[PDB]
Design a protein around this ligand. Structure first.
Ligand SMILES: Cc1ncc(COP(=O)(O)O)c(CN[C@H](C)C(=O)O)c1O
Lengths: 213, 223
């Protein structure tokens, strides 16, 4: 019943920076295993038997430790290394995995590409009105969205969704959906999607004017 | 090529039972141990247990959180691994993976190295419901790149699969995680393509919802 605690639980590494992930046990283990899991994929064996690198695993990677304290280290951080890492012990049954370490890769600040869409004719025929907004490919993660109907701020009825760091360009994407009744939607004229990001002093905004045609 | 494929996952009512499967190939099944591992959405991996190979009498070992409720078995005929789950609870909602465990050799670098894609199990009393698919076309060629989208709302349970142009369009695609609200799931998917190709070629998102045996296509007409 060995529990494995990893620290840190979340971290950002600059390119080239050295990285160390620690895994501590409630009891001694003869070896420690590590797994790297990237978003939307299955875990992959990374280090086995404490320090042996698995197939396709770069040399900048290494593992060490014994007893109840083990670690995984990346000598020089690379974009390809961004992922969640997990330690594992099979020294005593039942086997167990660590709490995990979500490792993101720091990159050049990127302003979000904001796209707003008015409710489709289809949904409107159904009696519902969902206004959607995409805040694609930005960095850092910290972004704040605000909905403004005819100048006022809207809070309720706003469902947000955030992606994890993308492997293609190391950015983050967010989707914000505002659902309203056909009635409330037609009671107003201007819909805006306001996003505050460290890339700009003033909010990045997109809007559209409900039109009859 | 080693392949592991889970299934049996889907919506299941609290307190009931669900049996998961894992078809395999590319190696002599009986010579290997097999493990089951689960990961609840946004959480850590959890080892559920394993079953041994012939040489070791196909014995089983179990995690403490499931001893008694879950049983692991294997049909050595058809080379299939199984996981029987009884008295299911919400905490059991997760993605389950089968993994080739240790084998009768010293190919250590290969232990716990092969995992299936995983199957999603959802434990809830909420009823199934097909998704309504809505296109997302801009309001007003403003730029060199135009982003399009598809709204998939009010379905249950997960998952759903979104693709663009039968998959011929994988680049520039963004599919945000689903968000649950009042026993209903909603998700969106954006695609970015050059202004040139659209509206000139035709962009379509294909959505499939196995649970409801729903599958629909939605062209993206301008507006
Ligand atoms: C994948 C795997 N399966 C099964 C076992 C034990 O097999 P059995 O319970 O039949 O003897 C081990 C040993 N753990 C090693 C020693 C370790 O990492 O400490 C293992 O690594």
């Amino acid at each position: 019943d060995i529990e494995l605690t990893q620290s840190p639980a979340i971290m950002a590494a600059s390119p080239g920076e050295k990285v160390t992930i620690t895994c501590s046990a409630t009891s001694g283990v003869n070896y420690m295993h590590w797994f790297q899991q990237k978003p939307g994929t299955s875990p992959k064996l990374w280090i086995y038997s404490t320090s042996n690198l698995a197939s396709a695993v770069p040399a900048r990677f290494s593992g060490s430790g014994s007893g109840t304290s083990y670690s995984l280290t990346i000598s020089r951080m690379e974009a390809e290394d961004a992922a969640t890492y997990y330690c594992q012990q099979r020294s005593t049954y039942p086997f167990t995995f660590g709490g995990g370490t979500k490792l993101e890769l720091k990159r050049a600040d990127a302003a979000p590409t904001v796209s707003i869409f008015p409710p489709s004719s289809e949904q409107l025929t159904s009696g519902g009105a969902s206004v959607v907004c995409f805040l694609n490919n930005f960095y850092p993660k910290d972004i704040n969205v605000k909905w403004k109907i005819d100048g006022s701020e809207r809070q309720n009825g706003v469902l947000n969704s955030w992606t994890d760091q993308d492997s293609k360009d190391s950015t983050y994407s967010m989707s914000s959906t505002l659902t309203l009744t056909k009635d409330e939607y037609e009671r107003h004229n201007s819909y805006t999607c306001e996003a505050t990001h460290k890339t700009s002093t003033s909010p990045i905004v997109k809007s559209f004017n409900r039109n009859e045609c | 090529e080693v392949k592991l494929q889970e299934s049996g996952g889907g919506l299941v009512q609290p307190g009931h039972s669900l049996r998961l499967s894992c078809a395999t190939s590319g190696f002599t099944f009986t010579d290997y141990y097999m493990s089951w591992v689960r990961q609840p959405p946004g959480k850590a991996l959890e080892w559920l247990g394993l079953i041994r190979n012939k040489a070791n009498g196909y014995t089983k070992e179990y995690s403490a959180s499931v001893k008694g409720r879950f049983t692991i078995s294997r049909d050595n005929s058809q080379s299939i691994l199984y996981l029987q789950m009884n008295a299911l609870r919400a905490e059991d909602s997760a993605t389950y993976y089968c993994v080739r465990d240790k084998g009768s050799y010293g190919n250590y670098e290969a232990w716990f190295a092969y995992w299936g894609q995983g199957t999603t199990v959802t434990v809830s009393s909420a009823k199934t419901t097909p998704p309504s698919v809505y296109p997302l076309a801009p309001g007003s060629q403003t730029n060199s790149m135009v982003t399009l989208g598809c709204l998939v709302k009010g379905y249950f349970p997960e998952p759903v699969t979104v693709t663009w142009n039968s998959g011929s369009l994988s680049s520039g695609v963004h599919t945000f995680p689903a968000v649950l609200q009042s026993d209903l799931y909603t998700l969106s998917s954006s695609v970015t393509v050059p202004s040139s190709p659209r509206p000139s070629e035709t962009v379509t998102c294909n959505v499939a919802h196995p649970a409801s045996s729903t599958k629909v296509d939605k062209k993206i007409v301008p507006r």
